């Protein structure tokens, strides 16, 4: 297909519209044009602060007529603030409320990373770091096995999230459910060859976030790296009379992956979905993998002393 095989027998589309960065002012149009175009998969979250407006679009595309609930794939996540098994529960409730649906297709633990509950989405040190939470990897996994049992969510998994932390959850006693998917970032400057064959190896599904390198990331500086604007990628894209975003987007798909591109911009929603027409050669595939600088983009660093920090091993 256009559509990978979940452990829960279900069928996830290869391509979806990301929704991180997308103001409440741009996100209903973005989603309704993605639907008229053809994306049936979307990636939301409660942090994005836009879910409610993602929803109404879905809602009027449904009730207008273009799509059926069945044929959707909505994905969302658990904030760091309700790793509390007692609180996992409400977290899926007001998101499903937000969304205006009665179920969700795949639910994520947003981070390996527990922080202390209150209003603030990121409670800070008094000096540098996040105020963590005593909460627990596999004991939070359970609070959402519970969510499947109760009907709320058809399937379940992890965001980003290393070999260690994965390999814990399937060694958990009493293990009722398997993670479906491991949402990680990937792109040409981290290819992550080796948790290619752990994640997936042995045997869960990978969704590549930030496929374009994310150049509207709040910590937006560098001076330097620039996947959209890179000389040697530009030429791949020229060869296929396609664009670089296209080449970028095709790239995870072709490694057995799932891609969530974001844009709010109707032009490039409709454009970003235009990627089934070409196959990258064996050489672009070799090359765009030779580009691996090990270079993280989501990265956050007032959380770095926290025990469950994804990015402290190599895979
Ligand atoms: N679990 C996680 O921690 C996590 C973290 C990061 C990302 N994700 C998810 O994955 C999705 C994708 O990542 P992203 O938001 O990080 O970054 P991204 O999709 O790689 O990059 C977003 C930016 O690329 C620009 N763009 C997109 N298509 C383009 C095109 N054809 N030509 C030129 N520019 C284009 C967009 O412009 P405009 O949008 O300004 O038009 C936008 O600001 C997110 O929306 C999010 O839901 C998950
Ligand atoms: O979480 C997301 O999907 C997107 N996203 C993100 O990626 N990080 C980085 C980050 C946060 C916490 C930890 Br722990 C590690 C990290 F590196 C953010 O700070 C972030 C901030 C606000 C919102 Cl609305 C989304 C964000």
From Swiss-Prot:
The modification N6-acetyllysine is found at residues 94, 221, 262. Changing residue 43 to N: Reduced glyceraldehyde oxidoreductase activity. The modification N-acetylalanine is found at residue 1. Highly expressed in embryonic epithelial cells (EUE) in response to osmotic stress. GO terms for cellular component: cytosol; extracellular exosome; extracellular space; mitochondrion; nucleoplasm. Cys-298 may regulate the kinetic and inhibition properties of the enzyme, but does not participate in catalysis. Tolrestat inhibits retinal reduction. NADP(+) binds at residues 9-18, 210-272. Transmembrane segments: none annotated. Belongs to the aldo/keto reductase family. This is Aldo-keto reductase family 1 member B1.
């Amino acid at each position: 297909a256009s559509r990978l095989l979940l452990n829960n027998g279900a069928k996830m589309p290869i391509l979806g519209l990301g929704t991180w960065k997308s103001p409440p002012g741009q996100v209903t149009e973005a989603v309704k044009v993605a639907i008229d175009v053809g994306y049936r998969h979307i990636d939301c979250a409660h942090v994005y602060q836009n879910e409610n407006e993602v929803g109404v679009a879905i809602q009027e595309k449904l009730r207008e007529q273009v799509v059926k609930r069945e044929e959707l794939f909505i994905v969302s996540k658990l904030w760091c603030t309700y790793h509390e098994k007692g609180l996992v529960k409400g977290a899926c409730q007001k998101t499903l409320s937000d969304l205006k649906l009665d179920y969700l297709d795949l639910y994520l633990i947003h981070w390996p990373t527990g922080f202390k509950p209150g209003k603030e989405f990121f409670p800070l040190d008094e000096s540098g770091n996040v105020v963590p939470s005593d909460t627990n990897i596999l004991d939070t996994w359970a609070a959402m096995e519970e969510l499947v049992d109760e009907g709320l969510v058809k399937a379940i998994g992890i965001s980003n999230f290393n070999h260690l932390q994965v390999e814990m959850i399937l060694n958990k006693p009493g293990l009722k459910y398997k993670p479906a998917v491991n949402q990680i970032e990937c792109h040409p400057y981290l290819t992550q060859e080796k948790l290619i064959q752990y994640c997936q190896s042995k045997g869960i599904v990978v969704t590549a976030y930030s496929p374009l390198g994310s150049p509207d990331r709040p910590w937006a500086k560098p001076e330097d790296p620039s996947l959209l604007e890179d000389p040697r990628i530009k030429a791949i894209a020229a060869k296929h009379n396609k664009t670089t975003a296209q080449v970028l987007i095709r790239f995870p798909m072709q490694r057995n992956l799932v891609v969530i591109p974001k844009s709010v911009t109707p032009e490039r929603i409709a454009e970003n979905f235009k990627v089934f027409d070409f196959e990258l050669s064996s050489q672009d595939m070799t090359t765009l993998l030779s580009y691996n600088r090990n270079w993280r983009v989501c990265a956050l660093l007032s959380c770095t002393s926290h025990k469950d920090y994804p990015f402290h091993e190599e895979f």
